[PDB]
Tab-separated table of C-alpha atoms in Angstrom:
chain	number	residue	atom	x	y	z
A	1	UNK	CA	94.167	75.724	92.854
A	2	UNK	CA	94.391	75.686	96.909
A	3	UNK	CA	95.002	72.139	98.470
A	4	UNK	CA	93.183	73.318	102.162
A	5	UNK	CA	90.012	75.756	101.254
A	6	UNK	CA	88.096	76.968	104.388
A	7	UNK	CA	84.530	78.203	104.455
A	8	UNK	CA	82.093	79.545	107.239
A	9	UNK	CA	79.524	81.989	107.577
A	10	UNK	CA	81.674	85.244	107.990
A	11	UNK	CA	79.537	87.551	110.747
A	12	UNK	CA	77.549	85.059	113.296
A	13	UNK	CA	75.512	86.985	116.387
A	14	UNK	CA	76.934	85.879	120.203
A	15	UNK	CA	75.317	82.390	121.926
A	16	UNK	CA	75.473	80.842	117.766
A	17	UNK	CA	77.208	77.827	117.258
A	18	UNK	CA	79.775	78.486	114.377
A	19	UNK	CA	80.341	75.921	112.074
A	20	UNK	CA	83.409	75.780	110.068
A	21	UNK	CA	84.545	73.197	107.054
A	22	UNK	CA	88.180	72.591	105.793
A	23	UNK	CA	87.602	71.494	102.445
A	24	UNK	CA	90.309	69.032	100.816
A	25	UNK	CA	90.954	69.728	97.827
A	26	UNK	CA	92.311	66.271	95.644
A	27	UNK	CA	93.343	64.234	98.049
A	28	UNK	CA	91.050	61.585	100.311
A	29	UNK	CA	90.595	62.474	103.921
A	30	UNK	CA	91.555	58.922	104.427
A	31	UNK	CA	94.426	58.927	106.914
A	32	UNK	CA	95.158	62.436	106.826
A	33	UNK	CA	96.139	64.676	109.458
A	34	UNK	CA	94.693	68.044	110.198
A	35	UNK	CA	94.613	70.700	112.655
A	36	UNK	CA	92.783	73.528	113.480
A	37	UNK	CA	94.332	77.262	114.504
A	38	UNK	CA	92.910	80.585	115.095
A	39	UNK	CA	94.296	84.126	115.018
A	40	UNK	CA	92.944	86.396	116.672
A	41	UNK	CA	92.939	90.328	115.505
A	42	UNK	CA	96.219	91.660	115.413
A	43	UNK	CA	97.018	88.462	118.390
A	44	UNK	CA	98.627	85.471	118.209
A	45	UNK	CA	98.299	81.993	117.215
A	46	UNK	CA	96.364	79.610	119.033
A	47	UNK	CA	95.367	75.984	119.040
A	48	UNK	CA	92.574	74.451	118.697
A	49	UNK	CA	92.906	71.004	118.266
A	50	UNK	CA	93.534	68.235	115.716
A	51	UNK	CA	92.624	64.889	114.122
A	52	UNK	CA	95.783	62.301	113.533
A	53	UNK	CA	95.990	59.783	110.201
A	54	UNK	CA	93.952	57.363	112.944
A	55	UNK	CA	91.281	59.954	112.979
A	56	UNK	CA	92.141	60.299	116.633
A	57	UNK	CA	90.771	63.585	117.522
A	58	UNK	CA	93.065	65.901	120.343
A	59	UNK	CA	91.157	68.803	121.551
A	60	UNK	CA	93.207	71.691	123.534
A	61	UNK	CA	92.205	71.982	127.074
A	62	UNK	CA	89.901	75.401	126.539
A	63	UNK	CA	88.294	73.756	123.928
A	64	UNK	CA	87.670	70.127	125.345
A	65	UNK	CA	84.193	71.515	126.308
A	66	UNK	CA	82.773	73.748	123.918
A	67	UNK	CA	84.525	72.080	120.490
A	68	UNK	CA	83.938	69.552	118.469
A	69	UNK	CA	86.026	67.890	115.467
A	70	UNK	CA	85.253	65.299	113.098
A	71	UNK	CA	85.404	64.101	109.366
A	72	UNK	CA	83.780	63.227	106.665
A	73	UNK	CA	85.137	61.204	104.009
A	74	UNK	CA	82.453	61.317	101.942
A	75	UNK	CA	81.677	65.524	101.067
A	76	UNK	CA	86.290	64.940	101.592
A	77	UNK	CA	85.359	68.011	104.903
A	78	UNK	CA	87.016	68.329	108.089
A	79	UNK	CA	84.528	69.609	110.636
A	80	UNK	CA	85.166	72.379	113.246
A	81	UNK	CA	81.599	72.843	115.204
A	82	UNK	CA	82.212	76.582	118.286
A	83	UNK	CA	79.775	76.006	120.884
A	84	UNK	CA	77.954	79.415	122.259
A	85	UNK	CA	80.282	81.799	120.899
A	86	UNK	CA	81.300	85.646	122.102
A	87	UNK	CA	83.115	88.373	120.831
A	88	UNK	CA	86.404	86.312	122.230
A	89	UNK	CA	85.951	83.464	119.373
A	90	UNK	CA	86.005	86.488	116.504
A	91	UNK	CA	89.285	85.649	114.898
A	92	UNK	CA	91.124	83.783	111.474
A	93	UNK	CA	90.422	80.227	112.015
A	94	UNK	CA	92.550	78.153	109.953
A	95	UNK	CA	93.524	74.251	108.675
A	96	UNK	CA	96.483	72.931	108.487
A	97	UNK	CA	98.050	69.805	107.362
A	98	UNK	CA	100.354	67.565	109.830
A	99	UNK	CA	102.309	65.549	106.891
A	100	UNK	CA	103.008	62.888	109.369
A	101	UNK	CA	99.996	62.218	110.989
A	102	UNK	CA	100.451	63.559	114.353
A	103	UNK	CA	96.498	65.104	115.830
A	104	UNK	CA	98.221	67.460	118.329
A	105	UNK	CA	101.284	68.883	116.890
A	106	UNK	CA	102.781	72.549	115.732
A	107	UNK	CA	105.778	71.916	115.239
A	108	UNK	CA	105.190	70.685	111.249
A	109	UNK	CA	102.355	72.514	109.917
A	110	UNK	CA	103.798	72.460	106.373
A	111	UNK	CA	100.340	73.211	104.202
A	112	UNK	CA	97.613	75.953	105.327
A	113	UNK	CA	94.401	76.951	103.989
A	114	UNK	CA	93.909	80.433	103.712
A	115	UNK	CA	91.651	81.408	106.705
A	116	UNK	CA	88.032	82.084	107.069
A	117	UNK	CA	87.710	85.381	109.191
A	118	UNK	CA	84.719	85.375	111.452
A	119	UNK	CA	83.300	87.974	113.549
A	120	UNK	CA	80.792	87.429	116.494
A	121	UNK	CA	78.451	90.571	116.666
A	122	UNK	CA	75.280	90.880	117.579
A	123	UNK	CA	74.510	93.185	114.049
A	124	UNK	CA	73.134	92.041	110.504
A	125	UNK	CA	75.569	91.921	107.752
A	126	UNK	CA	75.440	94.321	105.016
A	127	UNK	CA	77.135	93.894	101.429
A	128	UNK	CA	79.135	97.240	100.276
A	129	UNK	CA	79.048	100.140	97.275
A	130	UNK	CA	81.888	99.669	94.749
A	131	UNK	CA	82.858	102.646	93.682
A	132	UNK	CA	85.327	103.535	91.007
A	133	UNK	CA	88.490	105.545	91.851
A	134	UNK	CA	88.921	107.314	88.194
A	135	UNK	CA	92.299	108.207	86.877
A	136	UNK	CA	97.111	105.184	89.047
A	137	UNK	CA	93.337	104.211	89.316
A	138	UNK	CA	91.037	102.120	91.613
A	139	UNK	CA	88.143	101.022	93.632
A	140	UNK	CA	86.550	101.596	96.864
A	141	UNK	CA	84.513	99.170	98.023
A	142	UNK	CA	82.282	101.078	101.560
A	143	UNK	CA	80.055	100.814	103.891
A	144	UNK	CA	80.063	96.997	104.531
A	145	UNK	CA	79.427	94.875	108.184
A	146	UNK	CA	81.026	92.984	109.036
A	147	UNK	CA	84.545	93.404	109.743
A	148	UNK	CA	85.860	90.430	107.952
A	149	UNK	CA	87.587	92.194	105.661
A	150	UNK	CA	86.002	92.175	101.060
A	151	UNK	CA	88.803	90.838	99.381
A	152	UNK	CA	89.476	92.307	95.863
A	153	UNK	CA	91.056	91.339	92.665
A	154	UNK	CA	92.007	92.872	89.632
A	155	UNK	CA	91.955	91.769	86.031
A	156	UNK	CA	90.107	88.609	87.249
A	157	UNK	CA	94.043	87.205	88.989
A	158	UNK	CA	96.176	89.051	85.720
A	159	UNK	CA	96.775	92.491	87.760
A	160	UNK	CA	99.095	91.409	90.017
A	161	UNK	CA	101.839	94.405	89.954
A	162	UNK	CA	102.409	97.404	91.352
A	163	UNK	CA	98.628	96.464	93.528
A	164	UNK	CA	98.382	98.169	96.878
A	165	UNK	CA	95.089	96.776	98.449
A	166	UNK	CA	94.666	98.902	101.722
A	167	UNK	CA	93.623	97.815	105.786
A	168	UNK	CA	89.975	98.224	105.671
A	169	UNK	CA	89.323	101.389	108.125
A	170	UNK	CA	86.239	101.272	111.328
A	171	UNK	CA	84.249	104.822	110.019
A	172	UNK	CA	82.465	106.759	112.695
A	173	UNK	CA	78.932	104.477	111.237
A	174	UNK	CA	80.139	101.881	112.537
A	175	UNK	CA	80.513	100.326	108.681
A	176	UNK	CA	84.064	99.409	106.798
A	177	UNK	CA	85.351	100.725	103.981
A	178	UNK	CA	88.116	99.685	101.982
A	179	UNK	CA	90.430	101.005	98.887
A	180	UNK	CA	92.158	98.837	96.428
A	181	UNK	CA	95.045	100.854	94.047
A	182	UNK	CA	96.598	99.859	91.416
A	183	UNK	CA	99.654	101.625	89.136
A	184	UNK	CA	99.443	101.083	85.223
A	185	UNK	CA	100.893	103.201	82.713
A	186	UNK	CA	90.262	97.706	83.791
A	187	UNK	CA	87.718	95.802	86.421
A	188	UNK	CA	87.919	95.114	90.744
A	189	UNK	CA	87.345	91.629	91.447
A	190	UNK	CA	85.194	92.180	94.635
A	191	UNK	CA	83.675	89.442	97.134
A	192	UNK	CA	82.349	90.045	100.620
A	193	UNK	CA	81.501	86.263	101.646
A	194	UNK	CA	79.574	87.410	104.529
A	195	UNK	CA	76.944	88.546	102.491
A	196	UNK	CA	78.023	86.322	99.308
A	197	UNK	CA	78.042	89.649	96.925
A	198	UNK	CA	80.395	89.724	94.347
A	199	UNK	CA	80.476	92.323	92.469
A	200	UNK	CA	83.147	93.533	89.432
A	201	UNK	CA	83.132	96.954	88.759
A	202	UNK	CA	85.108	98.511	85.601
A	203	UNK	CA	87.732	101.370	86.352
A	204	UNK	CA	87.628	103.714	83.225
A	205	UNK	CA	88.413	108.343	83.812
B	1	UNK	CA	103.891	80.925	130.066
B	2	UNK	CA	105.349	77.993	127.593
B	3	UNK	CA	107.345	79.329	125.042
B	4	UNK	CA	108.970	82.733	125.395
B	5	UNK	CA	109.850	84.330	122.111
B	6	UNK	CA	112.603	87.759	121.922
B	7	UNK	CA	112.905	90.165	121.395
B	8	UNK	CA	109.353	90.910	120.517
B	9	UNK	CA	110.330	93.013	117.258
B	10	UNK	CA	113.527	94.323	115.678
B	11	UNK	CA	114.915	96.077	113.073
B	12	UNK	CA	117.216	96.037	110.880
B	13	UNK	CA	118.843	96.911	106.821
B	14	UNK	CA	118.702	94.535	103.914
B	15	UNK	CA	121.758	92.615	104.111
B	16	UNK	CA	121.788	92.381	108.011
B	17	UNK	CA	122.026	89.374	109.970
B	18	UNK	CA	119.245	89.186	112.829
B	19	UNK	CA	118.722	86.239	115.219
B	20	UNK	CA	115.510	85.320	117.205
B	21	UNK	CA	115.200	83.131	119.649
B	22	UNK	CA	112.638	80.945	120.894
B	23	UNK	CA	113.139	79.400	124.519
B	24	UNK	CA	110.868	76.780	126.704
B	25	UNK	CA	110.039	75.555	129.963
B	26	UNK	CA	109.832	71.577	129.027
B	27	UNK	CA	112.299	70.373	127.240
B	28	UNK	CA	111.210	69.734	123.288
B	29	UNK	CA	110.614	65.766	122.305
B	30	UNK	CA	112.505	64.581	118.999
B	31	UNK	CA	113.893	67.796	118.458
B	32	UNK	CA	110.085	68.898	117.102
B	33	UNK	CA	110.583	72.630	116.944
B	34	UNK	CA	109.488	74.788	113.875
B	35	UNK	CA	109.522	77.455	112.475
B	36	UNK	CA	106.977	80.065	111.374
B	37	UNK	CA	107.196	83.506	108.136
B	38	UNK	CA	103.754	85.108	108.716
B	39	UNK	CA	103.256	88.050	106.095
B	40	UNK	CA	100.443	90.728	106.155
B	41	UNK	CA	97.120	89.118	106.024
B	42	UNK	CA	98.458	85.537	104.681
B	43	UNK	CA	98.735	82.354	106.720
B	44	UNK	CA	101.673	81.358	108.512
B	45	UNK	CA	104.162	79.349	105.901
B	46	UNK	CA	106.373	76.656	108.131
B	47	UNK	CA	109.955	78.013	107.005
B	48	UNK	CA	112.069	75.236	109.561
B	49	UNK	CA	110.859	72.270	110.879
B	50	UNK	CA	112.809	69.984	113.033
B	51	UNK	CA	115.173	72.344	114.659
B	52	UNK	CA	117.060	72.717	111.569
B	53	UNK	CA	115.641	71.242	108.056
B	54	UNK	CA	114.340	74.079	105.879
B	55	UNK	CA	111.244	73.390	104.351
B	56	UNK	CA	111.526	73.502	100.390
B	57	UNK	CA	111.883	76.515	98.220
B	58	UNK	CA	112.905	78.525	101.577
B	59	UNK	CA	115.915	80.430	100.849
B	60	UNK	CA	119.165	78.991	102.526
B	61	UNK	CA	120.138	82.728	104.481
B	62	UNK	CA	117.178	81.193	106.899
B	63	UNK	CA	118.430	78.728	109.387
B	64	UNK	CA	117.755	77.186	112.356
B	65	UNK	CA	119.757	75.644	115.608
B	66	UNK	CA	118.977	75.168	119.764
B	67	UNK	CA	118.582	71.841	121.978
B	68	UNK	CA	116.132	71.406	124.063
B	69	UNK	CA	114.500	74.655	126.084
B	70	UNK	CA	117.177	77.055	123.758
B	71	UNK	CA	116.134	77.619	119.617
B	72	UNK	CA	117.506	80.261	117.334
B	73	UNK	CA	115.871	81.545	114.009
B	74	UNK	CA	118.864	82.974	111.830
B	75	UNK	CA	118.343	85.282	109.175
B	76	UNK	CA	121.658	85.568	107.871
B	77	UNK	CA	120.867	88.353	104.407
B	78	UNK	CA	117.663	90.491	105.610
B	79	UNK	CA	115.738	91.173	102.660
B	80	UNK	CA	112.298	92.844	102.024
B	81	UNK	CA	110.699	90.181	101.365
B	82	UNK	CA	111.949	89.096	105.093
B	83	UNK	CA	109.224	91.567	107.098
B	84	UNK	CA	106.890	89.570	108.286
B	85	UNK	CA	106.467	88.026	112.166
B	86	UNK	CA	107.761	84.695	113.055
B	87	UNK	CA	106.879	82.556	115.445
B	88	UNK	CA	107.856	79.341	117.017
B	89	UNK	CA	106.284	76.102	117.710
B	90	UNK	CA	106.971	73.100	119.793
B	91	UNK	CA	106.544	69.500	120.406
B	92	UNK	CA	106.742	68.081	123.996
B	93	UNK	CA	106.025	63.994	123.162
B	94	UNK	CA	101.545	63.890	123.757
B	95	UNK	CA	98.473	65.034	123.304
B	96	UNK	CA	97.870	68.871	124.923
B	97	UNK	CA	101.383	69.453	125.102
B	98	UNK	CA	102.168	72.249	122.394
B	99	UNK	CA	101.877	76.150	121.927
B	100	UNK	CA	102.967	78.737	119.475
B	101	UNK	CA	105.383	81.289	120.487
B	102	UNK	CA	104.288	84.824	120.829
B	103	UNK	CA	106.460	85.953	117.767
B	104	UNK	CA	108.320	88.198	116.742
B	105	UNK	CA	108.171	91.404	114.038
B	106	UNK	CA	110.599	91.744	111.453
B	107	UNK	CA	110.699	95.383	110.126
B	108	UNK	CA	113.658	96.354	107.465
B	109	UNK	CA	115.040	99.578	107.399
B	110	UNK	CA	116.265	101.489	103.950
B	111	UNK	CA	116.877	104.378	102.313
B	112	UNK	CA	114.506	107.182	102.472
B	113	UNK	CA	111.814	107.376	99.526
B	114	UNK	CA	109.398	110.142	98.778
B	115	UNK	CA	106.232	109.096	97.683
B	116	UNK	CA	103.976	109.691	94.730
B	117	UNK	CA	100.393	111.133	95.542
B	118	UNK	CA	97.098	110.678	93.630
B	119	UNK	CA	93.753	111.893	94.099
B	120	UNK	CA	90.310	110.865	93.184
B	121	UNK	CA	87.225	112.911	93.061
B	122	UNK	CA	83.979	111.311	94.052
B	123	UNK	CA	81.806	109.053	91.456
B	124	UNK	CA	79.138	110.406	90.197
B	125	UNK	CA	77.473	106.705	91.427
B	126	UNK	CA	77.929	107.629	94.584
B	127	UNK	CA	77.452	111.233	94.145
B	128	UNK	CA	74.131	109.794	93.442
B	129	UNK	CA	73.909	108.451	97.006
B	130	UNK	CA	74.389	111.726	98.654
B	131	UNK	CA	77.897	111.127	100.259
B	132	UNK	CA	81.268	112.404	98.606
B	133	UNK	CA	84.735	110.060	99.075
B	134	UNK	CA	87.420	112.064	97.906
B	135	UNK	CA	90.565	109.929	97.749
B	136	UNK	CA	94.345	110.641	98.176
B	137	UNK	CA	96.937	108.112	97.614
B	138	UNK	CA	100.832	108.257	98.728
B	139	UNK	CA	102.562	105.061	96.598
B	140	UNK	CA	106.212	103.625	97.677
B	141	UNK	CA	107.719	105.654	100.560
B	142	UNK	CA	109.991	105.065	103.403
B	143	UNK	CA	109.895	105.253	106.081
B	144	UNK	CA	106.312	105.413	107.370
B	145	UNK	CA	105.808	108.735	109.057
B	146	UNK	CA	104.113	110.950	106.752
B	147	UNK	CA	100.862	113.756	107.188
B	148	UNK	CA	98.254	114.109	105.196
B	149	UNK	CA	96.214	117.160	105.077
B	150	UNK	CA	92.330	117.791	103.398
B	151	UNK	CA	91.915	121.306	102.251
B	152	UNK	CA	88.413	122.314	100.050
B	153	UNK	CA	88.626	125.782	98.989
B	154	UNK	CA	91.915	126.061	100.959
B	155	UNK	CA	90.063	125.534	104.186
B	156	UNK	CA	91.680	122.559	105.949
B	157	UNK	CA	89.337	119.604	106.652
B	158	UNK	CA	89.782	118.156	109.753
B	159	UNK	CA	87.430	115.090	111.735
B	160	UNK	CA	86.252	113.695	108.322
B	161	UNK	CA	89.392	111.700	106.912
B	162	UNK	CA	90.545	108.393	107.835
B	163	UNK	CA	93.684	106.707	106.111
B	164	UNK	CA	95.091	103.345	106.415
B	165	UNK	CA	98.974	102.207	105.382
B	166	UNK	CA	100.082	98.616	103.166
B	167	UNK	CA	102.921	96.677	105.202
B	168	UNK	CA	106.473	96.846	103.935
B	169	UNK	CA	106.194	95.578	100.264
B	170	UNK	CA	108.068	92.373	99.162
B	171	UNK	CA	110.389	94.000	96.841
B	172	UNK	CA	111.061	97.513	98.017
B	173	UNK	CA	110.490	97.818	101.356
B	174	UNK	CA	108.101	100.614	101.215
B	175	UNK	CA	104.921	101.826	102.583
B	176	UNK	CA	101.672	103.274	100.795
B	177	UNK	CA	98.919	105.276	102.400
B	178	UNK	CA	95.335	105.819	101.182
B	179	UNK	CA	93.058	108.915	102.751
B	180	UNK	CA	89.722	109.257	102.231
B	181	UNK	CA	87.691	112.532	103.030
B	182	UNK	CA	84.161	111.750	103.705
B	183	UNK	CA	81.469	114.863	103.025
B	184	UNK	CA	77.884	114.755	102.035
B	185	UNK	CA	76.581	115.485	98.800
B	186	UNK	CA	75.386	118.854	100.179
B	187	UNK	CA	79.178	120.336	101.295
B	188	UNK	CA	80.305	118.810	98.929
B	189	UNK	CA	78.659	120.580	96.191
B	190	UNK	CA	79.212	123.685	97.788
B	191	UNK	CA	82.920	124.328	97.027
B	192	UNK	CA	84.938	123.617	94.284
B	193	UNK	CA	88.819	123.579	94.986
B	194	UNK	CA	89.775	119.915	96.668
B	195	UNK	CA	93.580	119.125	97.830
B	196	UNK	CA	94.964	117.003	99.397
B	197	UNK	CA	98.291	118.093	100.868
B	198	UNK	CA	101.174	115.486	101.512
B	199	UNK	CA	104.202	116.319	103.609
B	200	UNK	CA	107.142	113.520	103.570
B	201	UNK	CA	111.196	113.148	104.567
B	202	UNK	CA	111.001	112.574	100.865
B	203	UNK	CA	109.975	115.734	99.374
B	204	UNK	CA	111.758	119.236	100.053
B	205	UNK	CA	108.121	120.640	99.766
B	206	UNK	CA	104.823	119.188	100.703
B	207	UNK	CA	103.454	117.897	97.249
B	208	UNK	CA	99.492	119.708	96.625
B	209	UNK	CA	97.133	117.312	94.268
B	210	UNK	CA	94.142	119.001	93.566
B	211	UNK	CA	90.766	118.365	91.392
B	212	UNK	CA	87.884	121.334	90.733
B	213	UNK	CA	84.957	120.324	91.060
B	214	UNK	CA	83.900	118.891	87.237
């Protein structure tokens, strides 16, 4: 298991309030320092804010008037709220631990969550269709929205070697498509968290 | 601009020694300079902290140096698993004075490798829905340059295909590409031979893989 898990809605419309959580799996949040960072698609890393071991909460200059960062020790979750979102807020959002307890430091973030993808777009979520790529063998996850990519595993985590999960393609329809292949001498596990759709497809000749 | 990294991107061969630099306008407070490695689709990973301390488990080929406003990350024996974007981050003594560098991309050059080609017809389930997606796969090739050509009854297709490519593999430095040809069910069922032809520097002649509708 991973220690830091970010959670969020995936696709949101503009002007909405974005609510993200960062759950710590096995440790109390008392004295636990956390930092929020975001990364727009294809861009660099950007500091949002953080909480020190004394619960002191720091905000970047751009976020100080649109973001609220807080802690819920009874639920073991840090919370981030971003008001009046626009397309400029589309990014992968990460929480990361500073082991020294600092609330406004970027030089020693030694443990990261895997990030939660957020896309701000004025259109409704669409779950994908999963088709088998029958003989190497694969799965085609087609016609989903928003950009936030589906996740795909094989044999519920067993098949990891020779597996190539490709970047999604933006089709002419504006919907997204992704392909995952595996080289072999079978079930693909697709999760579209924005639609909370989980499909396990058996690929056979 | 608070922290600049140089160069924006670089390439070298397996076993080469490469250096990335990080410059700040203001002096770093208490050696607070860290180096992060970000692989494709993954969270950044802290490689170096306090200018020169290695994260446990990080290979000794990584080293950090520098002082004040000028710092350097050195990879002494470049490996395929080092393909990544590297970011520096500094601490300047307080609230708000902390930013990331813009990042430096590291690619690795290796020998030419020809792709293994596969073709997949549309599933019957998808054909129920009125659309047909045919998939061509190019596996483990180098360099990235490759051209995929779809042929339907030996008629060239254009505008009805899209492709994507993986990042350099962590073990063999190769790429992999997937190309999808999309047609309507009516247009799909009008022809029999569906083929994808692959042109790469590693192949003497283009390699074609094909299937007959049925």
